[PDB]
């Protein structure tokens, strides 16, 4: 069911300049925000502290604060050590967290990417390079694996702390996590690249959670030429999706965009192409192109 992600983005431009920014996700809801200029980790949900006590949080936060400045310097030194093997600018990404399952089953991960390619993971008790990783990497890895303190801290976060913290998040934020927001659909069209043809767009917006079914229909039959765009986010934590069919001019009548979502009960949204409402909404949309 749920994946917890801590995402770190670290940028090193030269010897002097660097910033680190982090964001935390539970499923597709954002729980935390940690900006380079902020000394503290910012809550983005009221239930972001999960079930941890004020001082439990500080123990977690203080450890991270010390980690941020220590990682920054450790990277700089690693560049100094790799005298021409690698050089600035440097982009590093860390993805760390937990995938929660039923019964307290839980899987942890800490993945590291260098210049956009996945290269290093923490596995068991130590750092590891993954297949296709560049070979110069291993020495840094050896250097880093000689630090059993770091190893013990990471093991605690992955084995125990993360599965514990997210159990608390899933509780304290249950209502937010299980909320249902209804899709709103509207039609439009543009001319196709092919002469004598149109592309019909069905816009679907403001729905939550993510799963959704959006198809063009002629009655019972489903139009196989339906193309589904990517899920695009709204700023109010809802999703947007559009399905585009291609038709011969004059074939639009009879067609309908049909939407299935969990927030609608068993009441699918059937939007008929030439409907009373499509006619009216279209009049409010006219523009000079």
């Amino acid at each position, epitope marked *: 069911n749920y994946t917890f992600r801590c995402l770190q983005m670290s940028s090193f431009a030269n010897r002097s300049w660097s910033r680190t920014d982090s964001v935390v996700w539970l499923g597709d809801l954002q729980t935390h925000r940690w900006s380079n200029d902020s000394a503290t980790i910012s809550f983005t949900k009221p239930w972001s502290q999960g079930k941890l006590s004020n001082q439990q949080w500080e123990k977690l936060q203080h450890m991270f604060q*010390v980690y941020r400045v220590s990682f920054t310097r*450790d990277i700089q030194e690693l560049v*100094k050590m790799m*005298s021409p093997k690698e050089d600035y600018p440097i982009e590093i990404q860390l993805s760390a967290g937990c995938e929660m399952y039923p019964g307290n089953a839980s899987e942890s991960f800490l993945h590291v990417a260098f210049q956009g390619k996945y290269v290093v993971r923490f596995w068991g008790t130590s750092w590891q390079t993954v297949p296709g990783a560049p070979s110069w990497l291993d020495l840094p890895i*050896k250097v880093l694996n*000689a*630090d059993q*303190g*770091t190893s013990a801290t990471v093991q605690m976060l992955l084995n125990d702390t993360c599965p514990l913290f997210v159990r608390g998040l899933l509780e304290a934020g249950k209502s937010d996590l299980e909320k249902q927001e209804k899709p709103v659909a509207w039609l439009s069209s543009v001319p196709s690249s092919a002469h004598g043809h149109r592309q019909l767009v069905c816009h679907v917006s403001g729905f939550y959670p993510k799963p959704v079914w959006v198809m063009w229909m002629r009655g019972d039959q489903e139009q196989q030429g339906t193309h589904r765009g990517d899920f695009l986010p709204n700023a109010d934590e809802t999703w947007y999706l559009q399905a585009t069919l291609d038709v011969e001019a004059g074939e639009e009548a009879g067609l309908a965009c049909r939407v299935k979502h969990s927030s609608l009960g068993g009441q699918d949204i059937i939007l008929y192409w030439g409907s009373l409402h499509h006619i009216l909404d279209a009049q409010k949309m006219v523009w000079n192109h």
Partner: T-cell receptor
Amino acid sequence: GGIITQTPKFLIGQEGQKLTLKCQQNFNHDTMYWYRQDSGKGLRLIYYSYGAGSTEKGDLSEGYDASREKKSSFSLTVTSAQKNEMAVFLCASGSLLDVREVFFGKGTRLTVVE
Amino acid sequence: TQVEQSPQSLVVRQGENSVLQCNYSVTPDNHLRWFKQDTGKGLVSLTVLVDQKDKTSNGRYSATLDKDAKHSTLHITATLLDDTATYICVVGDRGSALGRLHFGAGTQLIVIP
């Protein structure tokens, strides 16, 4: 299973003279250091290196340059000796795979005579 | 600095026991170690402390570390004349060779016969 040796033990310099001192090490240590020991202060890093060709600035780099010709050897140079100077210079080497293993040499005494 | 040693100078009768203090503020504090420096010579390693609460010993040298109080004590049992050389407390901020050592200004021990 060896030593780290600083040459020379003692150094007679004059005001504004270039200063050179060596440090050799046979522990197979990739890292090497140059500290300065001032009376009542404790060690301050001047230069360090992760290998040959590598010379990295420490907190006390101004006034000095250093060069690492090879793994076994690390030179420090005093660019311009101060008029009243009296200093101790300590070299150290370390394992890249074990921070705790750090060895020091017996030091170098500098006296600038007018 | 970030490493304070106390007192600056210590006087002990030969045969007695001597105690040396070290306080620090450095972070992270991976390990603390103690050095002996004879006059006109280098630094000799006495003992290295790594754990949160740790105790180490090397011949007549023993030391304790408190991570929590950021405090360390060196003990010399049955002090000899040879114990004259100055005593330096050092903290290392990483468990990897990427770290840096933070040096205390030291304590001179004077052993009266």
